[PDB]
Enzyme design. Structure first.
Site, PDB file in Angstrom:
ATOM      1  N   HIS A 226      -1.657   0.685  -5.206  1.00 43.74           N
ATOM      2  CA  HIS A 226      -1.692   2.016  -5.808  1.00 43.74           C
ATOM      3  C   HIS A 226      -1.570   1.970  -7.327  1.00 43.74           C
ATOM      4  O   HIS A 226      -1.810   2.978  -7.973  1.00 43.74           O
ATOM      5  CB  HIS A 226      -0.710   2.985  -5.130  1.00 43.74           C
ATOM      6  CG  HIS A 226       0.680   2.951  -5.656  1.00 43.74           C
ATOM      7  ND1 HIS A 226       1.685   2.237  -5.048  1.00 43.74           N
ATOM      8  CD2 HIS A 226       1.232   3.544  -6.743  1.00 43.74           C
ATOM      9  CE1 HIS A 226       2.806   2.405  -5.734  1.00 43.74           C
ATOM     10  NE2 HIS A 226       2.560   3.212  -6.759  1.00 43.74           N
TER      11      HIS A 226
ATOM     12  N   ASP B 140      -0.154  -1.569   0.879  1.00 38.92           N
ATOM     13  CA  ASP B 140      -0.047  -1.329  -0.566  1.00 38.92           C
ATOM     14  C   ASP B 140       0.213  -2.629  -1.327  1.00 38.92           C
ATOM     15  O   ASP B 140       1.308  -2.881  -1.827  1.00 38.92           O
ATOM     16  CB  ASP B 140       1.005  -0.242  -0.849  1.00 38.92           C
ATOM     17  CG  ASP B 140       0.997   0.223  -2.284  1.00 38.92           C
ATOM     18  OD1 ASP B 140       0.007  -0.060  -2.992  1.00 38.92           O
ATOM     19  OD2 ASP B 140       1.977   0.877  -2.709  1.00 38.92           O
TER      20      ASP B 140
ATOM     21  N   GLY C 146       7.023   3.950 -12.158  1.00 34.21           N
ATOM     22  CA  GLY C 146       6.973   2.864 -13.128  1.00 34.21           C
ATOM     23  C   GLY C 146       7.555   1.533 -12.675  1.00 34.21           C
ATOM     24  O   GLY C 146       7.277   0.515 -13.289  1.00 34.21           O
TER      25      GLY C 146
ATOM     26  N   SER D 275       6.904   0.725  -9.449  1.00 32.05           N
ATOM     27  CA  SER D 275       5.815   0.420  -8.520  1.00 32.05           C
ATOM     28  C   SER D 275       5.120  -0.895  -8.829  1.00 32.05           C
ATOM     29  O   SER D 275       4.752  -1.163  -9.986  1.00 32.05           O
ATOM     30  CB  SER D 275       4.750   1.537  -8.559  1.00 32.05           C
ATOM     31  OG  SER D 275       5.265   2.754  -8.004  1.00 32.05           O
ATOM     32  N   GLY D 276       4.942  -1.693  -7.779  1.00 32.41           N
ATOM     33  CA  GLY D 276       4.232  -2.974  -7.862  1.00 32.41           C
ATOM     34  C   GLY D 276       5.159  -4.141  -8.170  1.00 32.41           C
ATOM     35  O   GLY D 276       4.770  -5.298  -8.010  1.00 32.41           O
TER      36      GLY D 276
HETATM   37  N1  LIG Z   1      12.026   6.205  -4.608  1.00 34.84           N
HETATM   38  C1  LIG Z   1      11.171   5.189  -4.759  1.00 34.84           C
HETATM   39  N2  LIG Z   1      11.606   3.990  -4.371  1.00 34.84           N
HETATM   40  C2  LIG Z   1       9.902   5.375  -5.386  1.00 34.84           C
HETATM   41  C3  LIG Z   1       9.127   4.298  -5.829  1.00 34.84           C
HETATM   42  C4  LIG Z   1       7.907   4.528  -6.471  1.00 34.84           C
HETATM   43  C5  LIG Z   1       7.449   5.841  -6.671  1.00 34.84           C
HETATM   44  C6  LIG Z   1       8.188   6.917  -6.217  1.00 34.84           C
HETATM   45  C7  LIG Z   1       7.780   8.251  -6.402  1.00 34.84           C
HETATM   46  N3  LIG Z   1       8.160   8.986  -7.437  1.00 34.84           N
HETATM   47  O1  LIG Z   1       7.626  10.297  -7.336  1.00 34.84           O
HETATM   48  C8  LIG Z   1       6.854  10.292  -6.192  1.00 34.84           C
HETATM   49  C9  LIG Z   1       6.958   9.079  -5.609  1.00 34.84           C
HETATM   50  C10 LIG Z   1       6.250   8.699  -4.285  1.00 34.84           C
HETATM   51  O2  LIG Z   1       6.102   7.499  -4.038  1.00 34.84           O
HETATM   52  N4  LIG Z   1       5.868   9.707  -3.462  1.00 34.84           N
HETATM   53  C11 LIG Z   1       5.261   9.466  -2.252  1.00 34.84           C
HETATM   54  C12 LIG Z   1       5.779  10.019  -1.086  1.00 34.84           C
HETATM   55  C13 LIG Z   1       5.208   9.782   0.173  1.00 34.84           C
HETATM   56  C14 LIG Z   1       4.080   8.964   0.307  1.00 34.84           C
HETATM   57  C15 LIG Z   1       3.544   8.689   1.590  1.00 34.84           C
HETATM   58  C16 LIG Z   1       4.188   7.708   2.372  1.00 34.84           C
HETATM   59  C17 LIG Z   1       3.737   7.373   3.673  1.00 34.84           C
HETATM   60  C18 LIG Z   1       2.648   7.994   4.253  1.00 34.84           C
HETATM   61  C19 LIG Z   1       2.006   8.954   3.465  1.00 34.84           C
HETATM   62  C20 LIG Z   1       2.437   9.310   2.172  1.00 34.84           C
HETATM   63  S1  LIG Z   1       1.479  10.542   1.349  1.00 34.84           S
HETATM   64  N5  LIG Z   1       0.534   9.787   0.383  1.00 34.84           N
HETATM   65  O3  LIG Z   1       0.700  11.320   2.379  1.00 34.84           O
HETATM   66  O4  LIG Z   1       2.406  11.426   0.581  1.00 34.84           O
HETATM   67  C21 LIG Z   1       3.563   8.395  -0.843  1.00 34.84           C
HETATM   68  C22 LIG Z   1       4.129   8.650  -2.105  1.00 34.84           C
HETATM   69  C23 LIG Z   1       9.398   6.669  -5.581  1.00 34.84           C
END
Ligand SMILES: N=C(N)c1cccc(-c2nocc2C(=O)Nc2ccc(-c3ccccc3S(N)(=O)=O)cc2)c1
Ligand SMILES: [Ca+2]
Ligand SMILES: [Cl-]
Length: 223
Positions: A40, A84, A175, A177-178
């Site tokens: 991502h 990911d 930030g 991330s990765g």
């Molecule tokens: N708290 C953390 N460890 C973290 C790390 C990196 C970024 C963020 C973050 N900081 O702000 C947002 C964020 C975020 O990652 N939001 C998010 C929530 C849910 C999904 C997700 C997970 C599994 C299935 C589907 C989904 S989705 N893409 O449908 O929402 C993806 C991203 C938090």
């Protein structure tokens, strides 16, 4: 990193910064020419910054090397967050030294309950915004699959695991991330996602590196 501490300069010598005119993601050096990061975090024109502590000051020990290849997992799905993982090949091999060093890939998956080290230059606030100059660190345990699933409002796959503290206050964030999760000297996780950061009963989720070791080796060998 929310609720962590200052690592200390070059104490995490496998931690890299992905830079596109500014820091935007972390990564982990796994040999002199390859970095593991999150799918991502994909962008074109990435510069990899190795040996960093203060990302805003040239301190010495930095190596800046352009990405020549950024290889997103073919089965990465941006909706589900499954797979990911991305591999970045450096245009030239880094000069490995005490401050620029690879981290071992796992031979087996990490044990539930083990305390791991998460690191990065991401947001240090659970609400609001503060980005650090120097590298931040957080030690936190791997939680059970059952605990991760109960906490999450989203579908968790076998390629994810969760690490952190259910009371809130301690987590990776935007930030980070990765970047790495290292458990007993092995790279076991990639900072992937979370529902906000450091919220109660919303632990951090990480790509489960041990599932990808064969894929990583094959992809590197062929590129
Ligand atoms: N708290 C953390 N460890 C973290 C790390 C990196 C970024 C963020 C973050 N900081 O702000 C947002 C964020 C975020 O990652 N939001 C998010 C929530 C849910 C999904 C997700 C997970 C599994 C299935 C589907 C989904 S989705 N893409 O449908 O929402 C993806 C991203 C938090
Ligand atoms: Ca620097
Ligand atoms: Cl700082």
């Amino acid at each position: 990193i929310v609720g962590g501490y200052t690592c200390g300069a070059n104490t995490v010598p496998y931690q890299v910064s992905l830079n596109s005119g500014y820091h935007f993601c972390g990564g982990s050096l796994i040999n002199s020419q390859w970095v593991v990061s999150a799918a991502h975090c994909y962008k074109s024109g990435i510069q990899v910054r190795l040996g960093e502590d203060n990302i805003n000051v040239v301190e010495g020990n930095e190596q800046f090397i352009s990405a020549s290849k950024s290889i997103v997992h073919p089965s990465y799905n941006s909706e589900t967050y499954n797979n990911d993982i991305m591999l970045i090949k450096l245009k030239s091999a880094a000069s490995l030294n005490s401050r620029v060093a690879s981290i071992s890939l796992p031979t087996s998956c990490a044990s539930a309950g083990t305390q791991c080290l998460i690191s990065g230059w991401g947001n240090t606030k659970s609400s609001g915004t503060s980005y650090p100059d120097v590298l931040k660190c957080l030690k936190a345990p791997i939680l059970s699959d059952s605990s991760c699933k109960s906490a999450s409002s989203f579908i968790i796959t076998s390629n994810m695991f969760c690490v952190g503290y259910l009371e809130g206050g301690k987590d990776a964030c935007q930030g980070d991330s990765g970047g790495p999760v290292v458990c007993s000297g092995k790279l076991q996780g990639i900072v992937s996602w979370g529902e906000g950061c450091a919220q109660k009963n919303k632990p951090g989720f990480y790509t489960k590196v041990c599932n990808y070791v064969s894929w990583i080796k094959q992809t590197i060998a062929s590129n």
